[PDB]
Design a protein around this ligand. Structure first.
Ligand SMILES: N#Cc1c(C(F)(F)F)cn2ccnc2c1Cl
Ligand SMILES: N#Cc1c(C(F)(F)F)cn2ccnc2c1Cl
Ligand SMILES: [Cl-]
Ligand SMILES: [Mg+2]
Ligand SMILES: [Mg+2]
Ligand SMILES: [Mg+2]
Ligand SMILES: [Mg+2]
Lengths: 194, 194
């Protein structure tokens, strides 16, 4: 019984806009919100994909493959699932496998694809598909994987054992200045809680 | 190798601002980013998100979530109970306060994450993930009193932890809701733990 009344552009960048959002509260009173949106979303079911990449290899514990990048908004290095925006006309699955290969060098296999999920819904309309991908680390294609960073992409690969993910992220955070992503931390917490 | 040179303000609301970030790329090339920050952070992080494990004897262990209209999303989302940390408030106190206001449950701290980033390609927004247990058998949690702030309108949804991802998937299919990415990430890891 709540809905949007109006969305007024405040400031539009090349990549991001701020909007004044007018909506109907459930007592029937008009209220406003400050909403963030990307300018890059056309007909995609979501802005982006994040990839949960399970590196599977004979006589190895399963590893979750993570990436470490400088993030200008954070002003520092962040540990995240491999991720990127969906290109116009691209499937979430294709976006996930492409971004995984570009950022890690791994050639994955689709396992599952989430519905569109919200990144920070009190702040933004931003959505991703979370795509689970298995990587056959015994395939020659995944022997010495070579990242294909695009222009201004500078990504380091960090593979951590699934069976100790939360303690290994803690050890990485204890050792320098760097933020773990909330989705990675949430995923490492559930691995412990299970 | 990479660092912030300067930030230029583009637009500042009451709650959120757009900045143009200039940063040194690791080649020595100067580059720009459109960054979002909250105006409200003055704290270890902007917010807390509470993972509330509801423990009742002879019942499945449940994860308590909240359903709310999110004006940036233009729809209803399912999320961990969550809010901004008050100036001079600790992330633990924020966690117990937000949980009681949004759910009416009175919980105990199990653990508290370091600051984790919400959407680091877009914003500087950070939270503490606070794992809280709820003794659902204690009198204070019998008929729990949810205490909305000014303009909080929150529905409580407790889902069995052991089936969490299938229960969320079902809600998306029938209730045309968006699941929060951290809720989805946790739910995936509960399945992938096996
Ligand atoms: N009221 C209100 C409110 C809040 C809060 F819930 F935290 F109080 C956060 N916001 C972020 C952008 N626009 C808003 C508004 Cl309008
Ligand atoms: N280039 C660039 C770029 C990109 C992307 F990597 F996706 F291309 C996304 N952004 C979001 C906010 N500012 C940006 C900029 Cl500057
Ligand atoms: Cl627990
Ligand atoms: Mg990326
Ligand atoms: Mg990329
Ligand atoms: Mg809240
Ligand atoms: Mg509240």
């Amino acid at each position: 019984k709540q809905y949007i009344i109006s969305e007024e552009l405040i400031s539009e960048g090349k990549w991001v806009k701020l909007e004044k959002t007018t909506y109907m509260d459930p007592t029937g009173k008009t209220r406003t919100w400050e909403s963030v949106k990307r300018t890059t979303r056309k007909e995609q079911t979501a802005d982006g994909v994040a990839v949960i990449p399970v590196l599977q290899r004979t006589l190895h514990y399963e590893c979750i493959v993570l990436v470490k990048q400088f993030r200008p908004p954070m002003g520092g290095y962040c540990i995240e699932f491999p991720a990127g925006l969906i290109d116009d006309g691209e499937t979430p699955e294709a976006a996930a496998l492409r971004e995984l290969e570009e950022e890690t060098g791994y050639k994955g296999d689709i396992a599952e694809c989430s519905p569109a999920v919200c990144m920070d819904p009190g702040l933004s309309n931003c959505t991703i598909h979370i795509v689970t991908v298995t990587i056959n680390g015994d395939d020659a294609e995944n022997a010495r994987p070579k990242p294909k960073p695009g222009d201004g992409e500078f990504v380091e690969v960090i593979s951590l054992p699934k069976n100790d993910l939360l303690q290994r992220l803690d050890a990485l955070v204890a050792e320098e200045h760097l933020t773990v992503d909330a989705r990675v931390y949430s995923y490492a917490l559930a691995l412990k809680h299970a």
